[PDB]
């Protein structure tokens, strides 16, 4: 079980799709093995540059301690999904608490 | 890279007791486990020369421990090469 921070930006009009998506991925995590520590939804805010002809993406942050398998298939699920414009997964040391 | 789980299971299968960790047959078992794991690693990638230089360092270190163990006491040395699965 390794700790990973997962930050993605989802589309402006696909901000309405965010919560069940989240639980789907939590069904990917907690249904397989893992544990969600922080799940902090930033919501829509302004990019510094127009990624894909558009500003104002909807940011989601997820800190999660999980094995490598589930996050491999989660990265494959993040890639071919057309709702997210960018995703970033990092291996941190521990799990964190505060915003 | 030989997790502590594996180092403990080696050291309490080859050792005088649990806190004994620097005996030579323990060290030969440790280097054997890491050499086998890296034989896993170099099936792929084929061109990691720096990781190979670390591997060849630990191969030569195991060979010098083995020649010392043969020169010192052959009774546990022949048991070590029968048990640990190597020839020389």
């Amino acid at each position: 079980m390794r700790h990973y921070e997962i930050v993605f930006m989802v589309h402006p009009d696909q901000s309405e799709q965010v919560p069940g998506m989240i639980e789907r991925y939590t069904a990917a995590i907690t249904g397989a093995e893992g544990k969600i520590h922080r799940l902090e939804d930033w919501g829509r805010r302004q990019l510094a540059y127009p990624i894909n002809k558009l500003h104002k993406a909807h940011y989601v942050l997820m800190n999660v301690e999980a094995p490598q398998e589930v996050i491999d298939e989660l990265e494959t699920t993040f890639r071919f999904n057309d709702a997210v414009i960018r995703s970033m997964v990092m291996r941190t040391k521990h799990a964190v608490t505060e915003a | 890279s030989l997790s502590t789980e594996a180092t403990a299971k080696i050291v309490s299968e080859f050792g005088r007791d649990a806190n004994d960790t620097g005996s030579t047959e323990v060290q030969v078992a440790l280097l054997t486990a890491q050499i086998n794991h890296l034989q896993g690693h170099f099936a792929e990638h084929k061109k990691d020369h720096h990781s190979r230089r670390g591997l060849l360092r630990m191969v030569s270190q195991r060979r010098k421990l083995l020649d010392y163990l043969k020169r010192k006491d052959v009774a546990r040395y022949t048991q070590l090469i029968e048990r640990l699965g190597l020839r020389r």
């Binding site: 930050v7 930006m9 990019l47 510094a48 540059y49 127009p50 990624i51 993406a57 940011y59 942050l61 960018r86 970033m88 040391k93 915003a99 | -």
Partner: protein
């Protein structure tokens, strides 16, 4: 003086961009440790966090760019 030695932050994180806005220039370039007095491990961490924040569009690359 180095404030990052004062608060003792173990890993600077990109998610706070107020300090990251403080440590870049108005053109968006990272500001050298010669003038901020930042101690060098925090300078490396700070540049790494600034690039990680640029990738996530919490910071610009250049000030101009369309």
């Amino acid at each position: 003086f180095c404030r990052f030695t004062a608060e003792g932050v173990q890993e600077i994180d990109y998610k706070d961009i107020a300090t990251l806005k403080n440590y870049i220039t108005e053109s968006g370039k990272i500001v050298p440790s010669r003038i901020t007095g930042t101690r060098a491990k925090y300078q490396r961490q700070l540049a790494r966090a600034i690039k990680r924040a640029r990738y996530l569009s919490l910071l610009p690359y250049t000030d101009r760019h369309q």
